[PDB]
Amino acid sequence: LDWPXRWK
């Protein structure tokens, strides 16, 4: 989870 909230 990478800010502001995407899943990589």
Side-chain angles (χ1 to χ4, degrees), residues 2-8:
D2 280 267
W3 188 276
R6 64 192 173 281
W7 188 264
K8 82 189 95 293

